[PDB]
């Protein structure tokens, strides 16, 4: 048939080792451009004036970093939220100095990752699956949008986005606690519950299915060879796992429906991580965590410190040291 | 940078030694 149709049928083929798809067509070039720029900047890029103050930060291996201190550094505060493609610079040399790779990497990446999400929908359509895997992935995608896009928007600068590096990430976490008391935000307490509970329920389901594997092997061989791919039957006894777990606690604290059990596993972390992504996204507009500073006082009116006053003393130490040359005026309002 | 120069040999055998163990076990599996 016609060439446009051969092509469409290739793009959407469910025979390709890796699925392309129409989301695939945008995802592929953009993730490649982010990956190649990132790898090259991490090894070789020269220092970057993150805070706009002519004090460059060295992020790359060749300029004296290791795997753990290395980063692609966010773009200059002098740029704020202006678009800064390579073609807006007088020279690559100017682009490197002012943080250009960071913009290239995060934009191509947010985009390619958003299409990753759609591609999961797409393949599930072509396979005849239910479609909501992509909804579970929206929780980590949301989170990336928050630290790379939303938080810089509320604050006026991509320079306050999360760096692309191990130590840069910690830098970002400490500055955020000082400026937003994120630990005292419920949405983050929800995210911790999301991930602690996620890991807990992961170990539980893992340990409970594994606890009730049907003897189909001997002691000289992996019990894994008791499962044959695409076997009609189940390999553990869910009735037996229920009878164990219902006794560990009580009968109705235990799941006896498999579908209800797995939906629980999907929803618990996904929800909580939606909340903590919403957490970073709303503290992007300085709606901060609870403030109980000097909240208890005695008959006279002396302050009686609580543990929240001890948190605020730490916060304050982060406050006054961070970006130590970059404030001229008493309040750090962005 | 003034790094530990026994770090190279330490990283090197850290990789090679357990890596070698696994290759040995995989090949003699494929040949029976």
């Amino acid at each position: 048939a016609n060439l446009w149709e051969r092509f469409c049928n290739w793009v959407t083929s469910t025979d390709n080792r890796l699925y392309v798809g129409w989301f695939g067509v945008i995802m592929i070039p953009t993730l490649l451009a982010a990956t190649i720029c990132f790898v090259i900047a991490f090894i070789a890029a020269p220092p970057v004036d993150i805070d706009g103050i002519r004090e460059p930060v060295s992020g790359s291996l060749l300029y004296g970093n290791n795997i753990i201190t290395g980063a692609v550094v966010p773009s200059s505060n002098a740029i704020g939220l202006h678009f800064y493609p390579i073609w807006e610079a007088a020279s690559l040399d100017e682009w490197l100095y002012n943080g250009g790779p960071y913009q290239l990497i995060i934009f191509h990446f947010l985009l390619g990752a958003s299409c990753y999400m759609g591609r999961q929908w797409e393949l599930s359509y072509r396979l005849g699956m239910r479609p909501w895997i992509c909804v579970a992935y929206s929780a980590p995608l949301a989170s990336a949008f928050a630290v790379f896009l939303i938080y810089p928007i509320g604050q006026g600068s991509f320079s306050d986005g999360m760096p692309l590096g191990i130590s840069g990430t910690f830098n970002f976490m400490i500055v955020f606690q000082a400026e937003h008391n994120i630990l005292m935000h419920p949405f983050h307490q929800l995210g911790v519950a999301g991930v602690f509970g996620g890991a807990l329920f992961c170990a539980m389901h893992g340990s409970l299915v594994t606890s009730s594997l049907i003897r189909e092997t001997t002691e000289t061989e992996s019990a894994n060879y008791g499962y044959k791919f695409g076997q009609e039957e189940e390999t553990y006894n869910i009735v037996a796992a229920h009878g164990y777990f219902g006794r560990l606690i009580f009968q109705y604290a235990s799941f006896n429906n498999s579908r209800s059990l797995h939906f629980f596993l999907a929803a618990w972390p996904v929800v909580g991580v939606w909340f903590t992504a919403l957490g970073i996204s709303t503290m992007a507009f300085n709606l901060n965590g609870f403030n109980f500073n000097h909240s208890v006082i005695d008959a006279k009116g002396n302050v009686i410190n609580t543990w929240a006053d001890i948190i605020n003393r730490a916060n304050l130490g982060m406050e006054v040291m961070h970006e130590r040359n970059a404030h001229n005026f008493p309040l750090d309002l962005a | 940078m003034e790094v530990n120069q026994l770090g190279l040999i330490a990283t090197a055998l850290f990789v090679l030694v357990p890596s070698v163990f696994l290759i040995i076990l995989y090949v003699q599996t494929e040949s029976q």
Binding site: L61, L62, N66, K228, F229, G230 | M1, G7, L8, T11
Partner: peptide, 30 residues
């Protein structure tokens, strides 16, 4: 020598990725 070691190890990981995907034990249905 430290920069080299890091890039070498990262390069082996990416090579691993390629054989893990394209040269896997292919799954089969019995």
């Amino acid at each position: 020598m430290e920069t080299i070691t890091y890039v070498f190890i990262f390069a082996c990981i990416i090579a691993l990725f390629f054989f893990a995907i394209f040269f896997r034990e292919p799954p089969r249905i019995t």
